[PDB]
Design a protein around this motif. Structure first.
Motif, mmCIF file in Angstrom:
data_model
loop_
_atom_site.group_PDB
_atom_site.id
_atom_site.type_symbol
_atom_site.label_atom_id
_atom_site.label_comp_id
_atom_site.label_asym_id
_atom_site.label_seq_id
_atom_site.Cartn_x
_atom_site.Cartn_y
_atom_site.Cartn_z
ATOM 1 N N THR A 130 -34.819 -0.991 -5.992
ATOM 2 C CA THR A 130 -35.698 -0.559 -4.940
ATOM 3 C C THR A 130 -37.111 -0.464 -5.516
ATOM 4 O O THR A 130 -37.264 -0.270 -6.716
ATOM 5 N N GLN A 131 -38.123 -0.667 -4.698
ATOM 6 C CA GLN A 131 -39.479 -0.605 -5.167
ATOM 7 C C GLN A 131 -40.045 0.793 -4.925
ATOM 8 O O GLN A 131 -39.645 1.475 -3.974
ATOM 9 N N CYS A 132 -40.944 1.214 -5.780
ATOM 10 C CA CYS A 132 -41.544 2.525 -5.681
ATOM 11 C C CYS A 132 -42.956 2.455 -5.111
ATOM 12 O O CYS A 132 -43.481 1.367 -4.839
ATOM 13 N N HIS A 133 -43.563 3.615 -4.924
ATOM 14 C CA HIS A 133 -44.894 3.730 -4.345
ATOM 15 C C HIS A 133 -45.922 3.078 -5.281
ATOM 16 O O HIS A 133 -45.926 3.350 -6.482
ATOM 17 N N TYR A 134 -46.743 2.188 -4.712
ATOM 18 C CA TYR A 134 -47.770 1.381 -5.430
ATOM 19 C C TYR A 134 -47.158 0.201 -6.149
ATOM 20 O O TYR A 134 -47.849 -0.578 -6.828
ATOM 21 N N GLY A 135 -45.888 0.031 -5.959
ATOM 22 C CA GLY A 135 -45.224 -1.080 -6.539
ATOM 23 C C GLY A 135 -45.316 -2.273 -5.641
ATOM 24 O O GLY A 135 -45.653 -2.140 -4.453
ATOM 25 N N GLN A 136 -45.026 -3.419 -6.168
ATOM 26 C CA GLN A 136 -45.130 -4.629 -5.418
ATOM 27 C C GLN A 136 -43.826 -4.930 -4.709
ATOM 28 O O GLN A 136 -42.829 -5.220 -5.349
ATOM 29 N N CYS A 137 -43.831 -4.855 -3.399
ATOM 30 C CA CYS A 137 -42.665 -5.249 -2.625
ATOM 31 C C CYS A 137 -42.611 -6.763 -2.567
ATOM 32 O O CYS A 137 -41.591 -7.360 -2.265
ATOM 33 N N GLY A 138 -43.746 -7.369 -2.829
ATOM 34 C CA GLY A 138 -43.791 -8.771 -3.007
ATOM 35 C C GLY A 138 -44.129 -9.560 -1.799
ATOM 36 O O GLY A 138 -43.780 -9.205 -0.686
ATOM 37 N N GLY A 144 -39.981 5.899 2.847
ATOM 38 C CA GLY A 144 -41.164 6.701 2.777
ATOM 39 C C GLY A 144 -42.345 5.901 2.283
ATOM 40 O O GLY A 144 -43.457 6.425 2.183
ATOM 41 N N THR A 145 -42.104 4.638 1.963
ATOM 42 C CA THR A 145 -43.157 3.716 1.579
ATOM 43 C C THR A 145 -42.975 2.425 2.374
ATOM 44 O O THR A 145 -41.834 2.032 2.659
ATOM 45 N N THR A 146 -44.052 1.786 2.748
ATOM 46 C CA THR A 146 -43.985 0.576 3.552
ATOM 47 C C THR A 146 -44.505 -0.631 2.786
ATOM 48 O O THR A 146 -45.434 -0.511 1.995
ATOM 49 N N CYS A 147 -43.908 -1.775 3.019
ATOM 50 C CA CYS A 147 -44.335 -2.999 2.381
ATOM 51 C C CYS A 147 -45.507 -3.562 3.148
ATOM 52 O O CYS A 147 -45.352 -4.063 4.261
ATOM 53 N N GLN A 148 -46.673 -3.430 2.598
ATOM 54 C CA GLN A 148 -47.858 -3.893 3.249
ATOM 55 C C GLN A 148 -48.408 -5.115 2.554
ATOM 56 O O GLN A 148 -48.615 -5.113 1.322
#
Length: 36
Positions: A1-9, A22-26
């Motif tokens: 899983t990706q964390c906050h400020y991480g790259q969802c890609g 709680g974090t969105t892939c933007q």
């Protein structure tokens, strides 16, 4: 899983594409998308 400020890609990122709840892939750029 990706964390906050991480790259969802973006296009071509085969890593942790799923952001944590709680974090969105933007999409910041077509290849760089971050979990905010």
């Amino acid at each position: 899983t990706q964390c906050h400020y991480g790259q969802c890609g973006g296009i071509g990122y085969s890593g942790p594409t799923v952001c944590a709840s709680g974090t969105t892939c933007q999409v910041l750029n077509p290849y760089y998308s971050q979990c905010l």
